[PDB]
Amino acid sequence: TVLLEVPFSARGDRIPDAVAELRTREPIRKVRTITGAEAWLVSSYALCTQVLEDRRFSMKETAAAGAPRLNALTVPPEVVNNMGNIADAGLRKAVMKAITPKAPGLEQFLRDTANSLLDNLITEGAPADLRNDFADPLATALHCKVLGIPQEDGPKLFRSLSIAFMSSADPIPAAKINWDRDIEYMAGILENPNITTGLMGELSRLRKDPAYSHVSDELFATIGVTFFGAGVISTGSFLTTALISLIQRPQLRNLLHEKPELIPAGVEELLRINLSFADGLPRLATADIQVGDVLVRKGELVLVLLEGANFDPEHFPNPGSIELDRPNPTSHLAFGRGQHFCPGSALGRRHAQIGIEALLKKMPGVDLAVPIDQLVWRTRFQRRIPERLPVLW
Numbered sequence: 001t002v003l004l005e006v007p008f009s010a011r012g013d014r015i016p017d018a019v020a021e022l023r024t025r026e027p028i029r030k031v032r033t034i035t036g037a038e039a040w041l042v043s044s045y046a047l048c049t050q051v052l053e054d055r056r057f058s059m060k061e062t063a064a065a066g067a068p069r070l071n072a073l074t075v076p077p078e079v080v081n082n083m084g085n086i087a088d089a090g091l092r093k094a095v096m097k098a099i100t101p102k103a104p105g106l107e108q109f110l111r112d113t114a115n116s117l118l119d120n121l122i123t124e125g126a127p128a129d130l131r132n133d134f135a136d137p138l139a140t141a142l143h144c145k146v147l148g149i150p151q152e153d154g155p156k157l158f159r160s161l162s163i164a165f166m167s168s169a170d171p172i173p174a175a176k177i178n179w180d181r182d183i184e185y186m187a188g189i190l191e192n193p194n195i196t197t198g199l200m201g202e203l204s205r206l207r208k209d210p211a212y213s214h215v216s217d218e219l220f221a222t223i224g225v226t227f228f229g230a231g232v233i234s235t236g237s238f239l240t241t242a243l244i245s246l247i248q249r250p251q252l253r254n255l256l257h258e259k260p261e262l263i264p265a266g267v268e269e270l271l272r273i274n275l276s277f278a279d280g281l282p283r284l285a286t287a288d289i290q291v292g293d294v295l296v297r298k299g300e301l302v303l304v305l306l307e308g309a310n311f312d313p314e315h316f317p318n319p320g321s322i323e324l325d326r327p328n329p330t331s332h333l334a335f336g337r338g339q340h341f342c343p344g345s346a347l348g349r350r351h352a353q354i355g356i357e358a359l360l361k362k363m364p365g366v367d368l369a370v371p372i373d374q375l376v377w378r379t380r381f382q383r384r385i386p387e388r389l390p391v392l393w
């Protein structure tokens with residue numbers, strides 16, 4: 001037999017039995033990625049946290065020429081160090097502040113947009129596609145608002161994402177075409193006097209501030225493209241798969257409909273059980289480091305399997321059950337951990353909370369319109385998502 005291949009399954013509605021078997025018997029295990037490279041797959045909560053909390057397991061170094069790769073780059077190699085570049089430019093605080101969900105009127109905008117999307121689906125009649133006509137447009141509209149760019153520019157930027165977030169063995173020519181075009185768009189935004197709000201409005205001001213005069217225009221444009229793309233793909237994909245998990249749990253759906261104050265705790269559990277990340281998080285060892293029974297050597301690739309940690313019964317007893325009263329509810333790894341913890345975690349929570357609150361009010365009887373096995377799971381992609389999510393109500 002050949003070496004165990006990753007990823008195990010593109011399905012986002014069930015965890016393969018193999019994960020629990022590996023976690024119990026071999027919580028760090030050698031695997032082969034789609035490029036042919038070997039890697040260490042880490043699948044227990046304890047070892048996943050160890051890797052993510054030790055910066056000697058480096059994100060930046062995964063982009064080095066000649067390294068064992070999980071997948072091909074879809075961005076320039078320096079962009080793998082995006083957050084380090086933002087920090088070096090003195091822009092970290094400003095970027096973080098721009099992407100919080102607490103800007104005046106943002107939550108009301110999210111609620112209004114979700115309600116409008118849902119009203120259009122109700123008018124059109126069942127079946128409705130909750131990914132393409134709800135979750136993704138809601139994510140796109142949210143990120144246009146947060147960036148300060150026109151809502152009407154959302155769809156074309158969104159169209160890049162089915163390629164930008166591919167998990168491919170080989171470089172993708174279309175990724176460069178779209179990247180270069182989206183960079184040109186964001187560079188134009190920085191020069192557009194109408195853009196005075198949100199992240200791009202703030203970056204546009206800082207760009208002309210003497211304390212930032214040697215920050216490159218390339219970096220300012222890259223922040224726009226990367227935060228739009230990572231935010232939209234991550235929130236749209238998470239909400240989509242969370243809606244599946246909610247629909248498949250009518251008792252919980254009814255509880256959250258009846259007691260909406262429990263939605264934040266429900267979203268935290270939906271984050272914990274979420275299978276949206278299709279691959280382990282990659283890191284390259286910069287030293288020889290003991291992880292469990294394995295001495296990982298300098299230059300080797302490690303893959304941190306988020307659902308390995310998040311379904312680990314030693315940390316989350318009865319891991320497959322959504323329980324709203326856990327004592328460690330935010331200790332999951334859905335947003336990562338350590339140096340590269342998601343900078344948009346609060347916005348991602350609020351997007352899902354508001355989307356779910358709106359859906360349960362407008363469509364309390366929501367259910368799948370097709371048997372669950374009929375969902376078509378996107379392959380060779382950095383997220384697990386159904387191509388369509390047909391529902392009735």
Ligand code: HEM
Nearest residue numbers: 083230231234235238281334335336340342343344347348
């Ligand atoms: C529920 C929605 C989201 C989930 C589940 C999610 C998940 C994650 C995870 C697991 C990481 C860590 C990757 C790693 O360590 O290798 C990450 C990083 C990142 N996230 Fe999020 N996220 C979400 C929402 C957002 C939003 C709304 C934004 C921005 C608007 C965003 C922007 C980013 C960026 C830029 C990084 C890279 C941080 C870095 O390189 O250091 N994410 N996200």
Ligand SMILES: C#Cc1cc(C[C@@H]2NC(=O)[C@H](Cc3ccc(O)cc3)NC2=O)ccc1O
Nearest residue numbers: 075079080082083164225226229230234382
């Ligand atoms: C979430 C996440 C996430 C983070 C990273 C780490 C890192 N940091 C970054 O900011 C961007 C995100 C990105 C990738 C492709 C695009 O077209 C646009 C943005 N690239 C990076 O390599 C990688 C993949 C992700 O999925």
